[PDB]
Design a protein around this motif. Structure first.
Motif, PDB file in Angstrom:
ATOM      1  N   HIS A 192      96.639  38.648 -31.488  1.00 32.91           N
ATOM      2  CA  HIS A 192      97.510  39.057 -32.576  1.00 32.91           C
ATOM      3  C   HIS A 192      97.834  37.923 -33.536  1.00 32.91           C
ATOM      4  O   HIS A 192      98.817  38.011 -34.261  1.00 32.91           O
ATOM      5  CB  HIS A 192      98.812  39.639 -32.032  1.00 32.91           C
ATOM      6  CG  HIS A 192      98.615  40.776 -31.075  1.00 32.91           C
ATOM      7  ND1 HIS A 192      98.454  40.592 -29.717  1.00 32.91           N
ATOM      8  CD2 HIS A 192      98.543  42.113 -31.284  1.00 32.91           C
ATOM      9  CE1 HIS A 192      98.299  41.765 -29.130  1.00 32.91           C
ATOM     10  NE2 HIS A 192      98.345  42.704 -30.059  1.00 32.91           N
ATOM     11  N   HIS A 193      96.998  36.885 -33.567  1.00 29.29           N
ATOM     12  CA  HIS A 193      97.120  35.816 -34.571  1.00 29.29           C
ATOM     13  C   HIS A 193      95.816  35.590 -35.379  1.00 29.29           C
ATOM     14  O   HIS A 193      94.694  35.712 -34.862  1.00 29.29           O
ATOM     15  CB  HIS A 193      97.476  34.460 -33.943  1.00 29.29           C
ATOM     16  CG  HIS A 193      98.847  34.362 -33.340  1.00 29.29           C
ATOM     17  ND1 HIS A 193      99.159  34.872 -32.100  1.00 29.29           N
ATOM     18  CD2 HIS A 193      99.968  33.744 -33.785  1.00 29.29           C
ATOM     19  CE1 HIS A 193     100.420  34.594 -31.817  1.00 29.29           C
ATOM     20  NE2 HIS A 193     100.934  33.913 -32.824  1.00 29.29           N
ATOM     21  N   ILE A 194      95.998  35.194 -36.637  1.00 29.51           N
ATOM     22  CA  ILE A 194      94.919  34.798 -37.524  1.00 29.51           C
ATOM     23  C   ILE A 194      94.133  33.710 -36.822  1.00 29.51           C
ATOM     24  O   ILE A 194      94.695  32.991 -35.997  1.00 29.51           O
ATOM     25  CB  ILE A 194      95.459  34.249 -38.874  1.00 29.51           C
ATOM     26  CG1 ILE A 194      96.187  35.314 -39.672  1.00 29.51           C
ATOM     27  CG2 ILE A 194      94.394  33.638 -39.729  1.00 29.51           C
ATOM     28  CD1 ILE A 194      97.656  35.313 -39.383  1.00 29.51           C
TER      29      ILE A 194
ATOM     30  N   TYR B 137      90.999  38.003 -38.860  1.00 25.07           N
ATOM     31  CA  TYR B 137      91.846  38.665 -37.889  1.00 25.07           C
ATOM     32  C   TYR B 137      91.419  40.096 -37.810  1.00 25.07           C
ATOM     33  O   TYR B 137      91.482  40.830 -38.788  1.00 25.07           O
ATOM     34  CB  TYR B 137      93.314  38.574 -38.257  1.00 25.07           C
ATOM     35  CG  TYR B 137      94.203  39.413 -37.358  1.00 25.07           C
ATOM     36  CD1 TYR B 137      94.541  38.993 -36.081  1.00 25.07           C
ATOM     37  CD2 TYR B 137      94.700  40.626 -37.797  1.00 25.07           C
ATOM     38  CE1 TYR B 137      95.363  39.762 -35.270  1.00 25.07           C
ATOM     39  CE2 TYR B 137      95.515  41.400 -37.002  1.00 25.07           C
ATOM     40  CZ  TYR B 137      95.845  40.969 -35.741  1.00 25.07           C
ATOM     41  OH  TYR B 137      96.667  41.754 -34.966  1.00 25.07           O
TER      42      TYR B 137
ATOM     43  N   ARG C 293      88.248  41.540 -40.227  1.00 18.70           N
ATOM     44  CA  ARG C 293      88.479  41.330 -41.646  1.00 18.70           C
ATOM     45  C   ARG C 293      88.804  39.882 -41.984  1.00 18.70           C
ATOM     46  O   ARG C 293      89.322  39.131 -41.162  1.00 18.70           O
ATOM     47  CB  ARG C 293      89.582  42.264 -42.143  1.00 18.70           C
ATOM     48  CG  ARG C 293      89.679  42.318 -43.669  1.00 18.70           C
ATOM     49  CD  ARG C 293      90.774  43.276 -44.158  1.00 18.70           C
ATOM     50  NE  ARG C 293      90.663  44.580 -43.500  1.00 18.70           N
ATOM     51  CZ  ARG C 293      91.578  45.541 -43.560  1.00 18.70           C
ATOM     52  NH1 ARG C 293      92.686  45.364 -44.265  1.00 18.70           N
ATOM     53  NH2 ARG C 293      91.371  46.693 -42.930  1.00 18.70           N
TER      54      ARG C 293
ATOM     55  N   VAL D 241      91.146  37.935 -44.094  1.00 14.14           N
ATOM     56  CA  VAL D 241      92.352  37.781 -44.923  1.00 14.14           C
ATOM     57  C   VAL D 241      92.677  36.301 -45.013  1.00 14.14           C
ATOM     58  O   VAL D 241      92.266  35.560 -44.149  1.00 14.14           O
ATOM     59  CB  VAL D 241      93.543  38.508 -44.331  1.00 14.14           C
ATOM     60  CG1 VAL D 241      93.338  40.022 -44.423  1.00 14.14           C
ATOM     61  CG2 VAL D 241      93.749  38.060 -42.882  1.00 14.14           C
TER      62      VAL D 241
END
Ligand SMILES: CC[C@H]1OC(=O)[C@H](C)[C@@H](O[C@H]2C[C@@](C)(OC)[C@@H](O)[C@H](C)O2)[C@H](C)[C@@H](O[C@@H]2O[C@H](C)C[C@H](N(C)C)[C@H]2O)[C@](C)(O)C[C@@H](C)C(=O)[C@H](C)[C@@H](O)[C@]1(C)O
Lengths: 7, 209, 56, 122, 120, 114
Positions: free
Chosen positions: C40-42, C48, C51, C53
RNA sequence: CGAUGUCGGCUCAUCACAUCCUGGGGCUGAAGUAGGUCCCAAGGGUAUGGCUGUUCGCCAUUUAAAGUGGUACGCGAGCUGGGUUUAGAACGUCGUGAGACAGUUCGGUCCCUAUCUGCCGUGGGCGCUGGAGAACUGAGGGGGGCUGCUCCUAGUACGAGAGGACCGGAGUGGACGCAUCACUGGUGUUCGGGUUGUCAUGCCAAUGGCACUGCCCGGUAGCUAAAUGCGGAAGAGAUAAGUGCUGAAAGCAUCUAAGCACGAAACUUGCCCCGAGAUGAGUUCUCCCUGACCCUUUAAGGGUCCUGAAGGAACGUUGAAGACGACGACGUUGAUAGGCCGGGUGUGUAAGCGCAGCGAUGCGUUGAGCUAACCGGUACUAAUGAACCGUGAGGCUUAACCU
RNA sequence: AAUUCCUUGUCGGGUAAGUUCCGACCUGCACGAAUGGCGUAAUGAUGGCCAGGCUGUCUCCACCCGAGACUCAGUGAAAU
RNA sequence: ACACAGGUGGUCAGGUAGAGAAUACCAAGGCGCUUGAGAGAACUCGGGUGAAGGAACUAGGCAAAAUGGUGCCGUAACUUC
RNA sequence: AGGACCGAACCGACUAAUGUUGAAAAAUUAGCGGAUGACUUGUGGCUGGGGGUGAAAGGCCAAUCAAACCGGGAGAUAGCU
């Protein structure tokens, strides 16, 4: 201690 | 006799012809389906085990499910036993409605008290509060002395002290039953039962006169 | 309030029975870029859940 | 909610005008009197003529409390001030002979009938 | 003791908080991305997303409200002209919070928050 | 509160007219006087209102025989029966608690007349 | 004496019983109401004020009662420091004097972040003999145990009168306790409005900052008491003092030596809560694992490849759960939170424009505008596909069934 | 009585109730006239007593806003 | 003894309100005080509000609460006037 | 006119709470007194240890005072620990 007390 | 498992939706008045406000806790009482019966043979005692709500399939574990499997399943919120006493019930999801209390005048009711988490004395034990003033040095809501001197040379067990408060069992007893309403699964008992809105409730006919 | 006896070297250790650390294990891989990252982290690169971002 | 100390106004003649509650009778440690309870009283004001005189010690009936009264259904009656009817120390029973300001239904007692017979309201 | 309460405190007082989330709403609506602590980020939503919603209907009033909060004519302007219509059709959730995690100077848990269609 | 609400509105009066803080309503309340079950009229200024469905109340301030008396009716109670407005108040203010500090000539409220 | 803080109060207590109240009795110079006294009883309960530093005591007024004692005259690493009170000062008094005085008067730093024991809470570890999810049993422990008044019985029994019952009912209180926010209210610096000074957004108009939330009027949820529900019991066992039945030793008498019956808030239970670390580690239901192979000193032996379950944990969104752990809900087969839609609630008729007015201002559009934690809804955002831990049929002996 | 031990003397006042206070008495244990006596307007962060207002001082404590206490990261004491 | 809430003489002195070098908000100018991030328990510190009561607190109203400006009217004993 | 009045600067230190291994070997916060005077302040000077100075407390004379500090007699003496 002080003497103050506490006594 | 036995009793049932419900859910506090909770608290509203109902007015009467001759003009009186009866405060009632509103307990929703969906049918309780007996998941198991127990007997002196399969040791111990005479009791029935019901469930009542409805549960997400993906949340029901294998075991819980397998247990529901014996008898009419449809897994509910949880399980609860009631001890028996010369009444009898067969397990095929017998289903017990609010019907049970049509003639009952009493009812006891048990929730899980709202969670106060701490309190310390004063809140927890109604300890008195020291001088708010008058020279008091950092000892305004403190507990004050907690023992004698050398001779007990210790603090006795069960001393009233700060700590966890509420979020525990507690039942209420007596409580006039105001209204019974099948095909609505409602039960209005007169006023105030423990635990918060939404929380689970166990009601049984009162053990006391 | 102060000790009356030197706590022992043993007692010290005991108290620290719980002071020890836990690893992670829950280290997980991005579906697009390679990238190890905290769940649940970039990622380092800015991916992430596949995708991209964050350009940074 | 009346409690020790607390000035009360008086709702009768007798001539008290201002009066102080020196005890909430009726039980060990009883905190408050209200509604239509009885309290021990020391006269603080007193008109010149009057049945009572300043410094007397009597009983009295709470007849109006600002915290008011509830009774069934859930309503409330609140009065702007606190007033009572002096009672003779032995017989309860008003030493006065006229009542002033409204009184409430709760007072519908055997002993307090003489009050609601007098009194222009509720 | 907090039962059913709502609204984080962030170790400030009402005043400080109010002004900060004002400066931040700006900083978000302006740049469309900001880096900030996850707590601060999550709360930001309950400030910003209402503004964007408010903008979905243009009037003199709605602008003047969007100015009593935020207090920057450039952003009441970017809303309404840009963000207002740009989301005119979106149910809610105009933002999303992405977590990078653990600022160096203080180990604070960190996160990005962007307008959801940033794209650019 | 979805299973409530139902239980509640199936008890609510429907004939209740509309009043407003400032209005000089008269509430006619039932009273088992002593032997007789008669009506009794309470007339005063509406100084505060409820607005909670079944639990709706309101406070009427009377100034009787010297000093005031206030009554909070639970509007949907049987014991109320009748309630008619009798004068229209001009206040702009939801609660008229300030009236308590007034007295007579100082406590009059203008007609709303519209 | 290389230091054991000493009076009273406050807070919190805890035991004894030589019992103040409530309970059960014998005797009474016990008619009744009511006392006296002795026996049994420690379950619970056991006053607010005036004066004084007081404890005490006197006084006022309550109460069923306002018990006597132990606990370093319980309680300075809990508070107070009024009273003993050293450095100041004065009076009376003694002394030539310095000074001195259970004579007196005015004034006067009260440290300690809790290592250990103890104690209130709350987790981690391992055990409980394959692993796992629930529901239980209840050894044991703790909690609770108070009482007034009115009405009926009955103006009956009793008493010359006055007065006035036992026993048994019915209501309704005081103090205490548990719970809960429906009502009544408090708070509500996260809602709305009014308003002073000043600064700013270019100016009008409209808004924002700062002044304790600037001052203040209301107020949603939540938390709450003064708010409103409920509780002490009934019953059962075995008894205390006590009263008996039957009854010898002792032809009689005798409650007792055999034998039997009564008998109290004390005892064991009944009610509420905790509780299998109850290592004496219990019971019940359900779920999960049915691969290969090697080495030696060959045994509850070590290891290699395959395998990785039930479940758990981690992570995430989170809660009327919460110090942290913990506990509960949920993770797209989705309402877990935010947002969003509609409603409600609060405030009380926004801004803009029009009208009237010289203007302050009023009215219309308009019960408008705005509205937190509420309600009913809603996948718009965020809860990922996975990884991790946990294994692969579970010791010996004897017995009973079957092979 | 800044002097009174006996002493909470006695009488009067104020309070529901007053070992303090105000007014007296005189039995001054043990006042007394420049180690000044008795008075005194005004002044006093001076001592004692009373009342109105005021109130969380109290009955009896509730809620709220902030700083710590608690959790993470960095640094890192003390007496004994 | 410290990058220490202390002590340190002289000089200058804007706007709005104000009697003011008080005070509140600003200008010129100068700063946010050399650990932060979250939680929203007991308790402690510092503040805000409180039903009914109003000194019952206590050695003692300790502390809090209240009073609070200007003009005019008006103001007792006593007094060294 | 005033050891006059209310009140900032300035000078004081009556109450309370906080602090008491402090932020500080006496302060901080809220209140408080004086504030044209026996006022308050900068610089510099003089007074020396049984001596100084003292609106007098045994106060002060460099965080020291019923006889300062530094060195000396000096290993004072100690029937005490
Ligand atoms: C602030 C800082 C100071 O604390 C106070 O002053 C407190 C308030 C004193 O109490 C004050 C106040 C008070 C009431 O004592 C409690 C008073 O009686 C004494 C004389 O002085 C203490 C405690 C005194 O002790 C007491 O001395 C008594 C002779 C015996 C008593 N003991 C038997 C237990 C003992 O603890 C005494 C001597 O100062 C302790 C010695 C070691 C010190 O000199 C230390 C350095 C203290 O100055 C201090 C801690 O720094």
């Amino acid at each position: 201690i002080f003497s103050i007390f506490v006594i | 006799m036995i009793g049932l498992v419900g859910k506090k939706v909770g608290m509203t008045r109902i007015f009467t012809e001759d003009g009186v406000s009866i405060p009632v806790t509103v307990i929703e009482v969906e049918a309780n389906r007996v998941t198991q019966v127990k007997d002196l043979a399969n040791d111990g005692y005479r009791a029935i085990q019901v469930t009542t709500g409805a549960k997400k399939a993906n949340r029901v574990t294998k075991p819980e499910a397998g247990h529901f499997a014996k008898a009419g399943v449809e897994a509910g919120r949880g399980l609860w036993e009631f001890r028996l006493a010369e009444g009898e019930e067969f397990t095929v999801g017998q289903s017990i409605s609010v019907e049970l209390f049509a003639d009952v005048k009493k009812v006891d009711v048990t929730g899980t008290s709202k969670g106060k988490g701490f309190a310390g004395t004063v809140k927890r034990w109604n300890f008195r509060t020291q001088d708010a003033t008058h020279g008091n040095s950092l000892s305004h809501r403190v507990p004050g002395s907690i023992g004698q001197n050398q001779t007990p040379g210790k603090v006795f067990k069960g001393k009233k002290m700060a700590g966890q408060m509420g979020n525990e069992r507690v039942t209420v007893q007596s409580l006039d039953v105001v209204r019974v309403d099948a095909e609505r699964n409602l039960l209005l008992v007169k006023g105030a039962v423990p635990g918060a809105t939404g929380s689970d409730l166990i009601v049984k006919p009162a053990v006391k006169a | 309030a102060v000790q009356q006896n030197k706590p022992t070297r043993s007692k010290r250790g005991m108290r620290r029975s719980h002071d020890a650390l836990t690893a992670v294990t829950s280290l997980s891989v991005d579906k697009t870029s390679g990238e190890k990252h905290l769940r649940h982290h970039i990622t380092a690169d800015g991916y992430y859940r596949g995708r991209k971002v964050i350009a940074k | 909610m009346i409690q020790e100390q607390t000035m009360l106004n008086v709702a009768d003649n007798s001539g008290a005008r201002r009066v102080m509650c020196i005890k909430v009778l009726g039980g060990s440690h009883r905190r408050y009197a209200g509604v239509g309870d009885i309290i021990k009283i020391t006269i603080k004001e007193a008109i010149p003529r009057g049945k009572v005189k300043k410094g007397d010690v009597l009983k009295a009936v709470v007849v109006r409390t600002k915290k008011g009264v509830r009774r069934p259904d859930g309503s409330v009656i609140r009065f702007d001030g606190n007033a009572c009817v002096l009672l003779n120390n032995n017989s309860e029973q008003p030493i006065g002979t006229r009542i002033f300001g409204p009184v409430t239904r709760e007072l519908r007692s055997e002993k307090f009938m003489k009050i609601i017979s007098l009194a222009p309201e509720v | 003791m907090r039962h059913r309460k709502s609204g984080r405190q962030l170790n400030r007082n009402s005043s400080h908080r109010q002004a900060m989330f004002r400066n931040m709403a700006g900083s978000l609506v302006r740049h469309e991305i900001i880096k900030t602590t996850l707590p601060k980020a999550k709360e930001l939503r309950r400030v910003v997303e209402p503004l964007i919603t408010l903008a979905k209907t243009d009037s003199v009033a709605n602008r003047r409200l969007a100015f009593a909060r935020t207090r920057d004519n450039e952003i009441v302007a970017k809303l309404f002209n840009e963000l207002g219509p740009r989301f005119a059709s979106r149910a809610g959730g105009y933002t999303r919070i992405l977590k990078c995690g653990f600022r160096a100077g203080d180990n604070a848990p960190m996160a990005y928050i962007e307008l959801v269609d940033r794209s650019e | 509160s979805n299973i409530i609400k139902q239980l509640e509105q199936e008890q609510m009066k429907q004939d209740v007219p509309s009043f407003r803080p400032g209005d000089t309503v008269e509430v006619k309340v039932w009273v088992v006087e002593g032997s007789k079950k008669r009506l009794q009229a309470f007339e005063g200024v509406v100084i505060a209102i409820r607005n909670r469905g079944l639990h709706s109340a309101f406070t009427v301030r009377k100034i009787s025989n010297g000093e005031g008396v206030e009554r909070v009716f639970q509007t949907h109670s049987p014991v109320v029966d009748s309630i008619s407005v009798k004068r229209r108040g001009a206040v702009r203010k939801a609660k008229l608690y300030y009236l308590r500090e007034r007295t007579g000539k100082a406590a009059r409220i203008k007609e709303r007349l519209n």
